[PDB]
Structure 1
Amino acid sequence: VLSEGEWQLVLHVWAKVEADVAGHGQDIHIRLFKSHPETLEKYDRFKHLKTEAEMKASEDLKKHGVTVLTALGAILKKKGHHEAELKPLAQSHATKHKIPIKYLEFISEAIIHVLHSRHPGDFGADAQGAMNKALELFRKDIAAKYKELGYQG
């Protein structure tokens, strides 16, 4: 459970993301795919991308980043009251995409790294701590949904 203050810090930095969602999304995917190359292997639509400049140039990957962040943004703005937003996400990611919880840990790490890189003066130790907790909550709740659907990833 996050405090009200924690949620405010989360949402304060999120508003910075929303000034350039596409650019944040690109940087997060590029970070994820560099740090954990197996995740890219998992995306049939993107696994052909061989270099960082190809990744940055892909309109399709840029659009997907906006989709990912828009969904995460809508989740965070519910401040933990996110069942209606999380369920379909769990459904797809468990049953269609087959994404294990550990890949969600990887992209959470990517998010935190990008936000710190771009917004250090609004992403100090307390804001990082709040965002860590929000993303932990997201992963905990997605994991319970995966189990409910029969997926132990």
Structure 2
Amino acid sequence: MVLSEGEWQLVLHVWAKVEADVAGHGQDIYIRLFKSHPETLEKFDRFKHLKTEAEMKASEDLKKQGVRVLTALGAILKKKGHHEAELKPLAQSHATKHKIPIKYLEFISEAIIHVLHSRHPGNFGADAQGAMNKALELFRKDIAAKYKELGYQG
């Protein structure tokens, strides 16, 4: 699959708004993921004890993690599909160290789309959401191919 340049520009225009406060966006995305799909929280040995949204919001380590995730994803999106180098280390850690199924990558993709739809209606109308879904689907398709190369079913 391949995105057009116009689609990439819709992705990068909303990502520029995320970058006004990457930490706050990361907190919202993790809270949405863990509330919608609680099983995903069990994969985090440092955070699986958190019981409420208040505790998640107050966790400085979770905030730092959210900044790491969104900055890594942002660097992948800015490559506009030419992300082989960035996906190598990420696929290896997520397949072998963290053991994150493709289904859970689908869940965090849904959390990202929900938070952008809520915060950024000015840059996340239907065409922009479609472009972001295509970019995240491309990311998951290429991660899934690397998972298989690495020996992990996904």
CA distance in 2, matches of 1:11, 1:121: 13
Secondary structure of residue in 1 paired with 2:122: helix
Q: What is the TM-score normalised by the length of structure 2? A: 0.99
> How many pairs align?
153
Q: Percent of aligned pairs with the same residue?
A: 97
CA distance in 1, matches of 2:144, 2:129: 22
Shift of residue 45, structure 1, vs aligned partner:
0.7
The superposition leaves residues 21-72 of structure 1 with CA deviations (integer Å, 9 ceiling, x where unpaired) of 0000000000000000000011111001001000000000000000000000
Unmatched 5+ residue regions in structure 2? none
CA distance in 2, matches of 1:150, 1:119: 38
CA distance in 2, matches of 1:41, 1:150: 22
Superposed CA RMSD in Å reads: 0.4
Unmatched 5+ residue regions in structure 1? none
**Structure 1 residues 12-51: aligned runs within 5 Å:** 12-51=13-52
CA distance in 2, matches of 1:136, 1:10: 13
Post-superposition, which runs of at least 4 consecutive aligned residues in structure 1 deviate over 6 A? none
Q: What is the TM-score normalised by the length of structure 1? A: 0.99
The superposition leaves residues 101-132 of structure 1 with CA deviations (integer Å, 9 ceiling, x where unpaired) of 00000000000000010001210000000000
